Enzyme design. Sequence first.
Site, PDB file in Angstrom:
ATOM      1  N   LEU A  14       0.783  -1.245   0.000  1.00 50.75           N
ATOM      2  CA  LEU A  14       0.000   0.000   0.000  1.00 50.75           C
ATOM      3  C   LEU A  14       0.808   1.285   0.000  1.00 50.75           C
ATOM      4  O   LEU A  14       0.263   2.348  -0.237  1.00 50.75           O
ATOM      5  CB  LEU A  14      -0.932   0.020   1.176  1.00 50.75           C
ATOM      6  CG  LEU A  14      -1.892  -1.144   1.238  1.00 50.75           C
ATOM      7  CD1 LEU A  14      -2.565  -1.063   2.571  1.00 50.75           C
ATOM      8  CD2 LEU A  14      -2.873  -1.148   0.044  1.00 50.75           C
ATOM      9  N   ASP A 135       4.124  15.607   9.783  1.00 56.07           N
ATOM     10  CA  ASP A 135       4.113  15.064   8.415  1.00 56.07           C
ATOM     11  C   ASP A 135       2.721  15.176   7.748  1.00 56.07           C
ATOM     12  O   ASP A 135       2.298  14.286   6.988  1.00 56.07           O
ATOM     13  CB  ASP A 135       4.616  13.612   8.443  1.00 56.07           C
ATOM     14  CG  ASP A 135       5.160  13.118   7.102  1.00 56.07           C
ATOM     15  OD1 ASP A 135       5.634  13.920   6.275  1.00 56.07           O
ATOM     16  OD2 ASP A 135       5.137  11.893   6.885  1.00 56.07           O
TER      17      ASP A 135
HETATM   18  C1  LIG Z   1       2.003   7.274   3.390  1.00 59.73           C
HETATM   19  S1  LIG Z   1       2.392   5.504   3.256  1.00 59.73           S
HETATM   20  O1  LIG Z   1       2.410   5.246   1.805  1.00 59.73           O
HETATM   21  O2  LIG Z   1       3.541   5.284   4.130  1.00 59.73           O
HETATM   22  C2  LIG Z   1       0.977   4.729   3.967  1.00 59.73           C
HETATM   23  C3  LIG Z   1       0.229   3.834   3.213  1.00 59.73           C
HETATM   24  C4  LIG Z   1      -0.887   3.244   3.820  1.00 59.73           C
HETATM   25  C5  LIG Z   1      -1.232   3.551   5.144  1.00 59.73           C
HETATM   26  C6  LIG Z   1      -2.419   2.946   5.803  1.00 59.73           C
HETATM   27  C7  LIG Z   1      -2.502   2.852   7.186  1.00 59.73           C
HETATM   28  C8  LIG Z   1      -3.669   2.340   7.790  1.00 59.73           C
HETATM   29  C9  LIG Z   1      -4.716   1.914   7.027  1.00 59.73           C
HETATM   30  N1  LIG Z   1      -4.635   1.980   5.682  1.00 59.73           N
HETATM   31  N2  LIG Z   1      -5.569   1.579   4.780  1.00 59.73           N
HETATM   32  C10 LIG Z   1      -4.993   1.911   3.653  1.00 59.73           C
HETATM   33  N3  LIG Z   1      -5.587   1.696   2.426  1.00 59.73           N
HETATM   34  C11 LIG Z   1      -5.181   1.818   1.172  1.00 59.73           C
HETATM   35  C12 LIG Z   1      -5.968   1.289   0.150  1.00 59.73           C
HETATM   36  C13 LIG Z   1      -5.577   1.398  -1.187  1.00 59.73           C
HETATM   37  C14 LIG Z   1      -4.353   2.019  -1.525  1.00 59.73           C
HETATM   38  N4  LIG Z   1      -3.937   2.108  -2.800  1.00 59.73           N
HETATM   39  C15 LIG Z   1      -4.856   2.213  -3.945  1.00 59.73           C
HETATM   40  C16 LIG Z   1      -4.391   1.266  -5.052  1.00 59.73           C
HETATM   41  O3  LIG Z   1      -3.127   1.725  -5.530  1.00 59.73           O
HETATM   42  C17 LIG Z   1      -2.088   1.601  -4.554  1.00 59.73           C
HETATM   43  C18 LIG Z   1      -2.493   2.092  -3.144  1.00 59.73           C
HETATM   44  C19 LIG Z   1      -3.564   2.546  -0.492  1.00 59.73           C
HETATM   45  C20 LIG Z   1      -3.967   2.463   0.837  1.00 59.73           C
HETATM   46  N5  LIG Z   1      -3.760   2.432   3.732  1.00 59.73           N
HETATM   47  C21 LIG Z   1      -3.513   2.498   5.022  1.00 59.73           C
HETATM   48  C22 LIG Z   1      -0.466   4.490   5.860  1.00 59.73           C
HETATM   49  C23 LIG Z   1       0.658   5.065   5.284  1.00 59.73           C
END
Ligand SMILES: CS(=O)(=O)c1ccc(-c2cccn3nc(Nc4ccc(N5CCOCC5)cc4)nc23)cc1
EC number: 2.7.10.2
Length: 291
Positions: A14, A135
């Site tokens: 993710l 951040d």
């Molecule tokens: C800023 S980071 O990239 O370090 C990051 C990424 C994800 C999270 C995160 C922390 C806690 C819960 N969630 N749920 C999602 N969901 C999610 C769903 C889809 C996608 N994408 C859509 C499809 O293309 C790639 C990513 C990204 C994140 N992502 C999170 C926190 C930090």
Amino acid sequence: TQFEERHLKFLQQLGKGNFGSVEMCRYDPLQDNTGEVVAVKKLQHSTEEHLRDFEREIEILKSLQHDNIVKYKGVCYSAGRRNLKLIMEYLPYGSLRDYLQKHKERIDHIKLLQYTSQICKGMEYLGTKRYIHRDLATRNILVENENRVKIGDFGLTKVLPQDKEYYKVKEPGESPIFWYAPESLTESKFSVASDVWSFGVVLYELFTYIEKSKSPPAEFMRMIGNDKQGQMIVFHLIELLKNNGRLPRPDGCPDEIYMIMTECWNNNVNQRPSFRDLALRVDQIRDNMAG
Ligand SMILES: CS(=O)(=O)c1ccc(-c2cccn3nc(Nc4ccc(N5CCOCC5)cc4)nc23)cc1
């Protein structure tokens, strides 16, 4: 709130940021494909320095309960402390940065102000715990559904000392300098006021609809002159901000919303508005648009 490693099934990466990485996994302890999907954060490279930071980050998230803050579910030690994982609720719409970029035709200004308001409420709540986020950027805001976003990462978040209104920190490697307040660049001072500055950049990001040539890095570099690199970039950024150079009004952005951004971007730390006053002003503008 204790998760066994052997029941956690990888589905997708993710994102990476700062020194962690987040995966979508299915937690399936009955091994019958009925478990829920969860987000799992871990250190990119486990290290003693980072593990102690990661443990504090976990305690911070665990301490926070708010509609606009991503939910803590537990930790997975399992493969030892050096393979520490943070388990969080999975939000299905991804980062606001990505969501906005993909749905720009569907998301109006009224909707951007809903998100803005929700981000302010989350930040006000952090402030009541004397947490400094450090951040704030759309890449760290997550979309639960069309009507709800959450602050979704706390990798750089610090607690204020009991006797001071700022916290000095300098971590190794790359800092998101184009979201930073001047005093964070020149003095490494972080504060609720520096978070308000960054919130200004988030509001800019939203109203640009994440158009590539319009990101804060791309705009500041043009203003600085793209014929500069390395350790002279932050030097020139500091000078530009000291002389009241600022990110332009995004295309279509109303002046009353740009006024909010410019007030967050005050060089005088003490004159930046509070998160409560930002929520107030944003909600009034929202209403005047409702009618
Ligand atoms: C800023 S980071 O990239 O370090 C990051 C990424 C994800 C999270 C995160 C922390 C806690 C819960 N969630 N749920 C999602 N969901 C999610 C769903 C889809 C996608 N994408 C859509 C499809 O293309 C790639 C990513 C990204 C994140 N992502 C999170 C926190 C930090």
